[PDB]
Amino acid sequence: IRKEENGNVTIITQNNKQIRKYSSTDSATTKSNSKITVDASFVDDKFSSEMTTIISLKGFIPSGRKIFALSKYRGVMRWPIKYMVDLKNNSLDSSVKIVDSVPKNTISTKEVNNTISYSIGGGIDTSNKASLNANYAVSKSISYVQPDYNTIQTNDTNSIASWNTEFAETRDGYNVNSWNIVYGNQMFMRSRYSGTSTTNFTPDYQLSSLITGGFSPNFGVVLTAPNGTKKSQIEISLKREINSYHIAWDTEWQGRNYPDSKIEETVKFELDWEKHTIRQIS
Ligand SMILES: [Zn+2]
Ligand SMILES: [Zn+2]
Ligand SMILES: [Zn+2]
């Protein structure tokens, strides 16, 4: 397959048949300083019965971690047990559809690599693997990291694709279910007999970057639309759940994780299928 560049246009030729790809990028910042970036690739394929747009979602959700002493004998580490991302298609009434998305099902690897491949005619192939060793007319790579976390697709329909990236288990084998009758839950406990109430949490170099910094998701969807479609809408929601991991000293440190708070923010984007643009609206 031959491809050639012309700014935001890629002319793709495969066996006498030619298609075009138009790129559009928009960025938005939320009230709580979460970041969302959408890369839309509008495909123009006269040999396909409909219009196809591939959307790459890249974001940053701050961990919101805080460490403070309740007293000399009780310390608290607030941390993001769960990150949630929704891409909602608001135009199913106009028969605009999400026809595929990645990641699929559940992914547990520290590094996530997905691939969205388009074939002339409309065909779509989605892989939870990396590529790009195949001769697809258009392939889009998706990649992010999630040390100590897992990602599950909780919704996968024409109307919505949803992902939960939730804490799984520490390297030492502790999770939110761990309970030792003496030391309680020790998932983020640096030691059982040392440190102060704000000094005895797992050092930063031994915590997931999702806890020390934040989550940098990269997810993907594919939308289709009837040939004449001018505009459609999507909504992207970023959600973070914070928990409070308490350590309390009796004659040793005892650990316990409590629920705390949830923050959800939503950004709206309009797709102009004629001008090949994606713009935040509202
Ligand atoms: Zn077009
Ligand atoms: Zn699927
Ligand atoms: Zn605008």
Ligand nearest to the CA of 279: 3
Determination approach: X-ray
Closest to 53 measured CA to CA, from 226, 273, 217 = 273
Provide the domain count of the chain.
1
From the annotation, which residues make up the binding site? Answer: 44, 100, 156, 276
35: closest CA among 248, 238, 264, 194?
238
Å from CA of 49 to ligand 2 middle: 21
* Inter-residue contact 55 to 40 (CB < 8 Å): yes
Q: How far is the CA of 17 from the centre of ligand 2 (A)?
A: 29
C-alpha 233/C-alpha 266 separation (Å) is 13
Pairing of strands 218-225, 214-215: unpaired
CATH code of 250's domain:
2.70.240.10
Bridge-based pairing of strands 51-62 and 214-215 is antiparallel
Q: Whole domain around residue 149: which residue ranges?
A: 1-282
How far is Cα 18 from Cα 45, in angstroms, rounded to an integer? 8
Could you give the 3-state DSSP secondary structure of residue 137?
A: coil
Q: Counting ligands in written order, which one lies closest to the CA of residue 162?
A: 2
The residue with tokens 């934040």 is 214
Question: Alpha helices of the chain — where are they, by DSSP H?
Answer: 209-212
| 282, amino acid identity | S
DSSP 179-202: -BTTTB--TTBS-SS-S-TTT-B-
Q: Which residues pair with 269 in a beta bridge?
A: 234, 280
- Among residues 115, 158, 136, the alpha carbon closest in space to that of 45 is found at 136
Q: Which ligand is nearest to the CA of 280?
A: 3
Q: What is the resolution of this structure in A?
A: 2.4
What's the residue count for the chain?
A: 282
Of 61, 58, 57, 65, residue with least CA distance to 34: 61
Where are the extended beta strands (E) located within the chain? Answer: 2-5, 9-14, 17-29, 35-44, 51-62, 66-69, 74-89, 97-102, 106-107, 111-118, 124-127, 138-145, 149-156, 160-167, 214-215, 218-225, 231-249, 253-272, 277-281
Residues annotated in the binding site for Zn(2+), as ranges?
44, 100, 156, 276
The ligand with the least distance to the CA atom of 155 is 2
Query: Measured between alpha carbons, how far is residue 256 from residues 74, 98, 171, 201, 246 in Å?
Result: 11, 41, 18, 12, 5
Whole-number Å distance, alpha carbon 174 to ligand 3 midpoint, is 47
